[PDB]
Write a protein that binds this ligand. Structure first.
Ligand SMILES: *[C@@H]1O[C@H](CO)[C@@H](O[C@@H]2O[C@H](CO)[C@@H](O)[C@H](O)[C@H]2NC(C)=O)[C@H](O)[C@H]1NC(C)=O
Lengths: 50, 49
């Protein structure tokens, strides 16, 4: 009779973690593009002349 | 002219080829070797010029 109640905790925690994972993915998809530009700038403004 | 964009070293030209879900580039480069030392100087004086 309390397993029904525990089913609410489980589905709350699961959604709370689901939001975190998606937020992490969306945020980390930006650092890739921010570091790709740094790599591009370092290979031409240091190793040569722009 | 931008360095280290297509190939490692000075760039000459390239060829594209297909792939199942993408493209494959073949770059032709140009790399020097067999160096020496010699001795240099910035300019040469002659008759005060
Ligand atoms: C140009 O001269 C320099 C120095 O005279 C050469 O550099 C030395 O090469 C010897 C080769 O056995 C090494 O043992 C030394 O350690 C080198 N010097 C230093 C400071 O590391 C150089 O090899 C010469 N260039 C050519 C193409 O022969």
């Amino acid at each position: 009779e309390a397993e029904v109640q525990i089913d609410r905790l489980i589905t709350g925690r699961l959604q709370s973690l689901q939001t975190y994972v998606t937020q992490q993915l969306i945020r980390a998809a930006e650092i890739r593009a921010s570091a790709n530009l740094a790599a591009t700038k370092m290979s031409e403004c240091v190793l040569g002349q722009s | 002219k931008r360095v280290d964009f297509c190939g490692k070293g000075y760039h000459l030209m390239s060829f594209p080829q297909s792939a199942p879900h993408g493209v494959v580039f073949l770059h032709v480069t140009y790399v020097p070797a067999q160096e020496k030392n010699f001795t240099t100087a910035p300019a040469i004086c002659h008759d005060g010029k």
